[PDB]
Design a protein around this ligand. Structure first.
Ligand SMILES: Nc1ncnc2c1ncn2[C@@H]1O[C@H](COP(=O)(O)OP(=O)(O)O)[C@@H](O)[C@H]1O
Length: 330
């Protein structure tokens, strides 16, 4: 079965949309894995758009269910020493941050499974520290967070010297599918909770970028990379080294790297040779994590409000395009 999982997640009405007495036009059916939009400016009951995906998560879907479906199979591959990428795609205010970062529950117990509102990124770190420690495998975990705007790279974690300088990138001679981003701040994570500091720094930096770059907030991609270094011995000296990399990507709604990414995924899905990784910064950076038949995931976040009709249709079309799944009968 395809190693490229494409899922749609529709959030619930917030409260503001409630004040604007927003109403629903999106029809979620997680059993048939279909999401339908009911069009009609002057009220239409003779044409509704339906899409099918690998998974459809309605408003009541809890974080752990999204995580268990999308991330678990993938983290499995990363722990085996492979490179994988999980994308979050959708316009602002649809649910990427909630899905990718979520809400913290400090002062509480845990188990990567019990955290009620933790997002993919924190929960991933949470499962990593729990899984590898229970297994008794020696490991280290470092992370980076870069931004892509107007096909230029920006380090969102570098402490000093960080008010506008670009990161440079060039292929590196010993992994033709990889590239080297010199100067890219890589922060080592000693315990799961340390990720919150990182995300805040990233967020602050992102807040500044917006005051310098027009529509940054809606035209930037972020790649949050977590590298896992593992090693197990055998009281004989036999060492097994595994280095895994998981890219958590936040894609800006289609309201360049986005164009090339859809052609690459489509190409991987259709098995067309010559996947155009080189035609954008994002696809060059992730090339080595969209390698063999590695596992890939794309979460499309949408709003259930009629007011976002066009945006939802936009997001859905893109997800549908990346991996075309034929609608079932009836
Ligand atoms: N599925 C959800 N369940 C409860 N609240 C959600 C859910 N998804 C998003 N939200 C809420 O929406 C807002 C966050 O949206 P956000 O994730 O930032 O969207 P985007 O990723 O487009 O920026 C907060 O109110 C957050 O609590």
């Amino acid at each position: 079965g395809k190693n490229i999982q494409v899922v749609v997640r529709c959030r619930p009405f917030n409260l503001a949309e409630r004040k604007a007495s927003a109403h629903s036009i999106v029809e979620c059916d997680p059993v048939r894995k279909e999401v339908s939009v009911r069009t009609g400016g002057l009220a239409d009951k003779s044409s509704r758009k339906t899409y099918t995906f690998d998974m459809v998560f309605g408003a009541s879907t809890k974080q752990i269910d999204v995580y268990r479906s999308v991330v678990c199979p993938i983290l499995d591959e990363v722990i085996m020493g492979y490179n994988c990428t999980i994308f979050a795609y959708g316009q602002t205010g649809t649910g990427k941050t909630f899905t990718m970062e979520g809400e913290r529950s400090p002062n509480e117990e845990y188990t990567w499974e019990e955290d009620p509102l933790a997002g993919i990124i924190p929960r991933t770190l949470h499962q990593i520290f729990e899984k590898l420690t229970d297994n008794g495998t020696e490991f280290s975990v470092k992370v980076s967070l870069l931004s892509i705007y107007n096909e230029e790279l920006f380090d969102l974690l570098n402490p000093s010297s960080d008010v506008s300088e670009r990161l440079q990138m060039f292929d590196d001679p010993r992994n033709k599918r990889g590239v080297i981003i010199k100067g890219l701040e890589e922060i080592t994570v000693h315990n799961k909770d340390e990720v919150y500091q990182i995300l805040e720094k990233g967020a602050a930096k992102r807040t500044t970028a917006a005051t310098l770059m027009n529509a940054y907030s809606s035209r930037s991609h972020s790649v949050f990379s977590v590298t896992i270094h593992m090693k197990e011995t055998t009281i004989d000296g036999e060492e097994l080294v595994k280095i895994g990399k998981l890219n958590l990507v936040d894609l800006a709604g289609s309201e360049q790297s986005l164009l090339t990414l859809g052609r690459v995924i489509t190409a991987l899905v259709e098995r067309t040779p010559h996947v155009p990784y080189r035609e954008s910064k994002l696809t060059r950076i992730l090339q080595d994590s969209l390698g063999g038949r590695t596992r890939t995931s794309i979460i499309a976040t949408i709003s259930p409000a009629s007011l976002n009709l066009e945006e939802t249709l936009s997001t859905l079309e893109y997800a549908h395009r990346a991996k075309n799944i034929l609608n079932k009968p009836e």
